[PDB]
Amino acid sequence: EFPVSEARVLEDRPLSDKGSGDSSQVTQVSPQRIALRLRPDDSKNFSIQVRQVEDYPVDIYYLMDLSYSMKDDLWSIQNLGTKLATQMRKLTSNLRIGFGAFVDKPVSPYMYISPPEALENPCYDMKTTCLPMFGYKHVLTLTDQVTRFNEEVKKQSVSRNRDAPEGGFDAIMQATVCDEKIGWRNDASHLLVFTTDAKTHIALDGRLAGIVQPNDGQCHVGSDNHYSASTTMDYPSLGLMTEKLSQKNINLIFAVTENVVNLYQNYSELIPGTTVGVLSMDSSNVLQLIVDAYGKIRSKVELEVRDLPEELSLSFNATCLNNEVIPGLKSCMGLKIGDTVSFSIEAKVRGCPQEKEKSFTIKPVGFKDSLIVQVTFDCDKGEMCSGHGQCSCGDCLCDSDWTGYYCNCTTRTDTCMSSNGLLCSGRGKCECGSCVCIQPGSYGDTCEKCPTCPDACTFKKECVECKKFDREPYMTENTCNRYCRDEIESVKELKDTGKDAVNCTYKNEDDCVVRFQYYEDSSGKSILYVVEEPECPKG
């Protein structure tokens, strides 16, 4: 023998809803360290927990489009900052606040060229003078003075450009890689609100303007606070934006106007962990937009890896509700700020290679706290051995993120995605990438389809008999909250008029007739209007 071990090493414990932690150095992830000595071809298991610590300090950077159309916008936003704090105060003690402005690369085809020189200065045609072209200006780093925000902003002036699509991806990048200027707190919840009404320049668009150097991803600002390489460096690729977003734990929010909404969602679908919120024409809607995303931001625990030797492979079996588990996943949604979850990982090397510290990390997307795992290896014609398909020799040792005898099977769940996020629409189980529906009379890649399945008025029934009656199942399995995410409410006598939702009716344990209504609009609504005082048998 030569036992494989997983000696835990450092482990402050989750800081039970203690964001302002007075010298308790706030921790959200259970064991801040650990170490495993893997022998050849042997695996080892270890748990990992992470919590959404209450009263966690927020950092919010206001990056808005400064095009002429953002005239009305810059009006009902000057009052913000102060208006913002009051709402965010009921969610955090230390709230940092910053601002930033962009429009588009101040250059040749995007900028108003240089027709008369009487143009490098204004919006000449229409008599309404404005500021020249800038692209990315940084005014007001993140500070305490939520009022001082109202200052800079009232002092902000609009501009104008020829091209419809603005050059924001450039800003979104600097306002991230440039931590020092922006002032991002280490232990804090970073936010980057991105407001706009127009399309946008992606990478390679800048070839027209004569820019062939691709975004390096570095911080490019000078003493003056204007993105210096704007005119000499192409817009960043959707991927580099990603790589850098995760690396600085910045949360991108897309507050955009309905006209260009649907477009920014697919950009989100490519930038995981990104949030999109329907912004307003006048932009007053902005805070009730920010304070909504925060919720979304802190309601998921996507566990992310980093580095990790090729030889060892991690397998997860997440669990985020009353110890009922869900083998395969390594993330969780539907959590309220303060809840704790665990994951349980499993390292495993395919034939110990050569030594070194080999240290990789593990942590949830967005968090600073992480589980640093330092691995060490205690181990110091043909070959019908297969059928191939990544399958090696010996007698078929599958590769990382590949399982099964033939090495047929996968470890991927992304395939088993869905619109609502939940694995296999919640009617089936992910099996080697492809869902295998626990058939209630349904089908489809993710079991999405089920024309034969009972109307929602039979799915929600259990919800109003729970969150409004303290009865029925889910009240029994303790899964009434995390599950019935829906926000019910008692309708003052009669209910809604809006014919864009459905009204139900049913008999409760009490033999009374409940009448409710399932609705859903603007920013992902789903209220369950319940007529107060059901009709019970009189006597």
Binding site: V212, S237, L270, G441
Partner: protein, 927 residues
Amino acid sequence: FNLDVDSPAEYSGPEGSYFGFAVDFFVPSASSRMFLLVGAPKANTTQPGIVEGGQVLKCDWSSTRRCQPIEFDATGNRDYAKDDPLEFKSHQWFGASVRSKQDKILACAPLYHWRTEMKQEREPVGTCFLQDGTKTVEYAPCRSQDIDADGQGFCQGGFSIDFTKADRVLLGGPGSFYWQGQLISDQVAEIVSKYDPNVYSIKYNNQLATRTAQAIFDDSYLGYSVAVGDFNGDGIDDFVSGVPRAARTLGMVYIYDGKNMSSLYNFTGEQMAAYFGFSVAATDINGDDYADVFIGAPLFMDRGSDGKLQEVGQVSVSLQRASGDFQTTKLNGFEVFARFGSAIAPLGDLDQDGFNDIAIAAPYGGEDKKGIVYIFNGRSTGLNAVPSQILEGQWAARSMPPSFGYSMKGATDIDKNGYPDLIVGAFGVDRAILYRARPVITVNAGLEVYPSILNQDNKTCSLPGTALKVSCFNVRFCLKADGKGVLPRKLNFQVELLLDKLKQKGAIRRALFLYSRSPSHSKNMTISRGGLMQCEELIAYLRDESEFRDKLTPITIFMEYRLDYRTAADTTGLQPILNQFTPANISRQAHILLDCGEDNVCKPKLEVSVDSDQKKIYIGDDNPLTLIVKAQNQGEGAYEAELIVSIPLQADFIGVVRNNEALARLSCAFKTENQTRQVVCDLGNPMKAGTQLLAGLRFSVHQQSEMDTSVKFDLQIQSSNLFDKVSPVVSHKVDLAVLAAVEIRGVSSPDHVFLPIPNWEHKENPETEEDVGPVVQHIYELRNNGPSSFSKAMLHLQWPYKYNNNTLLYILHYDIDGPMNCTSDMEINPLRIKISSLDIHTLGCGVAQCLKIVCQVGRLDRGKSAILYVKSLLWTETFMNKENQNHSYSLKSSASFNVIEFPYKNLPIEDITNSTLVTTNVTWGIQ
């Protein structure tokens, strides 16, 4: 697949002049020597007041490397008035695009700014310049009278250029109209024969050009990249142009025709912001003359094993079917962040195999973002997805990334030899490189030993030193090697012969050469001609019995062979390379006579049987199939015994069965060498005598469908024996069957309506849904799940309707999804009730009068369903709040189905049927 990389032509340019941003081969018909064209935007010039007008350098192949400029325009900025230029040439990026016919070369400047003739301005319309040895004319198809962005003011034409077969320059301007972009194709000798140095417009005769599209189409960037080829009927090439921002950043790729300029085929990217269209190319990748489109999406993000998105890019490779349609495929990049389809450049034949190659390029790939060039080859099957080679850049970085491979051209042969060439451009280090393709020698070997069977007590060749007559056996090796270009006359090969290779470092090597003893003989040959196998033979013997144990482990002879240099051209020799798919290893087997006595030779009796168990493979899905084989040798010895399992097309071999104890784990292995598929198994070299094998062979037959009715395999054993070398072939057909588990799910939406109904008035004569009652919606779904799909079936639905001449669940209409049609024996919605405008409980047919809706289905494959969506609504006359007990009703609906016809015919079909009922209970809930 193989170009030289030992010593390629290193062409350089000035610091910061983007030397190499655009490349091409100059091949004037007026001279015998070809040249190199290298764009150099950002290159200072001797034009008055013009800073970085860029230039174009003509580089000579003549091993000197002196390559300085091309006299295009030396005139500075023209004037419209005194102190106000008409044009601005400074920073015009002249050189960004460089094409060239023969003697004809078109260079452009996509950032050429012009003042309008109207008000003061500086719009970037761009211009091109077409030289012709002597005559040089300016070509600005966008300098039209119309200006501003709403017109061709920011056109930036010349962004991309290209000549057609019959000379007709295709050209692009990504900013035309509102950055929609546009293509312009103008005849050459129209462009020349219309040039008037005193006009800034020039109406062109036979000009082809695209129109302004609708608003929604803005910022699409048509003409961002362009290629030309024939995609419609016969004749002239058509216009292929990539629009990276088409759709919603999805990117599209249009193909207009070279005569009407009318739109033909379109292509669309699958992912947003990937720049599907950054580059394109048309070339026949599979030798059958039909141009094949290749479209680059350099920023594409695929999925790694870990499931996360990686930015590596893909190259959509669409093959052209003679039917006008396409058989598109895809090919992803290798590293992350190195754009991959960043620059497609089809070559000719870096192998002359009769199929064209192509070189995709990742300008940021390799270590230190030095960029590499993967050179995929072509086959009739399409394009072989495996980089036959990778051109690794070798330039550091001075100010920005080298961008090696960002621009490249290859299709003309600059040197002597009959093989193409390639020019790559690394403009980050300001340079372009010439890769010379090498000669491809294909060489056949061939070797065989004389007596194959050895007799220990054989006395024929006297030993070297002494004269002890010993058991002789000779072996002769030979080979032919014919090229296909500048190389022949002295294909000299270094061959090697080895005896008893199966013998490791153990040294029980019982075979040596005559005049010299050792199992290793060295030798070098030569050749040249096509069919002149220059040969040679050697005498080899066998060690005495009294000095080695054996028991038969074939004395295998071995042959290795390799070329040598100084087998090439004068101007620095280009060493050939043997074709990649040809082995420099051949070896035969020698045995020793053993047990092959009495008659003196081995004559085996061979047989293979099969039980034909589990005979059933349902049409449709992956049907697992195992074959229990019984290989038997009943005669004498049998060398190189082996099983030949001939499987069908839709066969596919998995492995030999180990999971079962009682079976043999043969050294089987699937193979296709000739136009035949077959599993080959080692049945023991000398399969002894009376030896019996019984292994299992598993597969997975793929459906076909009306393949008549049965799938057969063909079994036969064979061996290298001289007599009775095989066995009577045994065939085995496995029968295809039909199974289609169709089911009928059904469901009522408001399955339970509580009758006291919230505020409802009894109307005399109704007109709307609100006047009648609550909607009740029955949904019926017929779904075929079974592997076998069906071709025709019937759906019968009985609906309630009335009861005692009283309506119940009045139908408004029905809808269908999938291959199905229906008919109600009665008129649906008589009262024509449009939308809002502003006998116990069970009522299931037999009790009530039916409204029968009959439906005709036809073609529900493996996993497809057909659905009927009925939308009724309680008439609410389910009242009678009086007399007996109007309490509890059911309103039953029922629908059955019958599968009447399948596609397969020769297989025994069985009618598939069943039914399902759907209730909607209307109860009195409070009372």
